[PDB]
């Protein structure tokens, strides 16, 4: 049975080293058996998991009251946090399945 993937926004986020950067992951769940993961793409071109909801400390996920949206925040961004990020919804039942968001970019700049 088809279901839509989460969306992940904005497409590009630019911040200076030391600031925070927040993406928004949006998921229209059709039931309550799911979990949301936040990933980054490794040099290897492999998803590295950063955090999940429900629940290193620099990567935080927060579920908003609207029952759709999640804030995914890099606290105290560093230059080497620059790269490609995505979120993934995992259906837990009736069939365990992951659907990935589109990928977005973080650029973390040198403080002048």
């Amino acid at each position, epitope marked *: 049975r088809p279901w839509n993937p989460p969306t992940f926004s904005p*497409a590009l986020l630019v911040v*200076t080293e030391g600031d925070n950067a927040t993406f928004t992951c949006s998921f229209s769940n059709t039931s309550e058996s799911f979990v949301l993961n936040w990933y980054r793409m490794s040099p290897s071109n492999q998803t590295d998991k950063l955090a999940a909801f429900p629940e290193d400390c620099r990567f935080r996920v927060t579920q908003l009251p609207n029952g759709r949206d999640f804030h995914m925040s890099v606290v105290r961004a560093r230059r080497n946090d620059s790269g490609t990020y995505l979120c993934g919804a995992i259906s837990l039942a009736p069939k365990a399945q992951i659907k990935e968001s589109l990928r977005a970019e973080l650029r973390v700049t040198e403080r002048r």
Partner: antibody, heavy 115, light 110 residues
Framework: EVQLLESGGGLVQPGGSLRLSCAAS????????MTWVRQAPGKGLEWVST????????YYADSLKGRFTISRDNSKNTLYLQMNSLRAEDTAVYYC????????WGQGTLVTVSS | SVLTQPPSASGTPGQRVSISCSGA????????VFWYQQLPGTAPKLLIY???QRPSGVPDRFSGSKSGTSASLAISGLRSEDEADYYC???????????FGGGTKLTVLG
């Protein structure tokens, strides 16, 4: 849903200064990067400045030579552009836009630099 | 502008037109390309994000691609309503700036 409304445009004398405002609604402003872009009559878009949600990261076109300051007040859902030492060449429509890349744009406000 | 586009482009109704955007390794080569449509008398609107994705409201007649330091916007099924100025843009990681291309005026002849 998203709405962006510029104000503060109009006539200013050469060497003068002006502050533009942009009022935002329909999204979570405090975490959202915000941008100014301008466009002189009959010419191309020129990126001016972007500010991070917190205000702690700001970027500027090199051509401005630090005459402009971007700022924001998350309390009021408002973005600002302070423009100083204005020259004829600054005459343009100034657009407020959401994100560094402008997923949504205001309708713009015309700044005319003239005596 | 450091993203160069043809100043003009044209086709006739129903045809396919392509608008190029040329950059460098520090921008198009390593960063996502975005495109904008600016109809006469209006503010720009986002047309393509992340090289090739369409925001909601944008028909599938518009597509984007990128290879190396060049990118392209294609418009299939050209219509009168497509007459507009089109811009590409991208981040430049060598100067830490956002750059708009110089813009392309699209006319629909015939």
């Amino acid at each position: 849903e998203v709405q962006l409304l510029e104000s503060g445009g109009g006539l200013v004398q050469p060497g003068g200064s002006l502050r533009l405002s942009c009022a935002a609604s329909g999204f979570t402003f405090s975490i959202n990067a915000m941008t100014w872009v301008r466009q002189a009559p009959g010419k191309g878009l020129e990126w001016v400045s972007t500010i991070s949600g917190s205000g702690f990261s700001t970027y500027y076109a090199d051509s401005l030579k630090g005459r402009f300051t971007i700022s924001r007040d998350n309390s009021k859902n408002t973005l600002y552009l302070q423009m100083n030492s204005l020259r004829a060449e600054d005459t343009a429509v100034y657009y407020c836009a959401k994100e560094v890349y402008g997923d949504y744009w205001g309708q713009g406000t015309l700044v005319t630099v003239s005596s | 502008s450091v993203l160069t586009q043809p100043p003009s482009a044209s086709g006739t109704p129903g045809q396919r037109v392509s608008i190029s955007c040329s950059g460098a390794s520090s921008n198009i080569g390593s960063q996502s390309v975005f495109w904008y449509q600016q109809l006469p008398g209006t503010a720009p609107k986002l047309l393509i994000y992340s090289n090739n994705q369409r925001p909601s409201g944008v028909p599938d007649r518009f597509s984007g691609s990128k290879s190396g330091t060049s990118a392209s916007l294609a418009i299939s099924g050209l219509r009168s309503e497509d007459e507009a100025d089109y811009y590409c843009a991208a981040w430049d990681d060598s100067l830490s700036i956002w750059v708009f291309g110089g813009g392309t005026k699209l006319t629909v002849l015939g």
